[PDB]
């Protein structure tokens, strides 16, 4: 998965 690129 990923933590996103918020």
Same mark, same amino acid.
């Given at each position: $998965?990923?933590?996103?690129r $918020?």
């Amino acid at each position: $998965h990923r933590f996103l690129r $918020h």
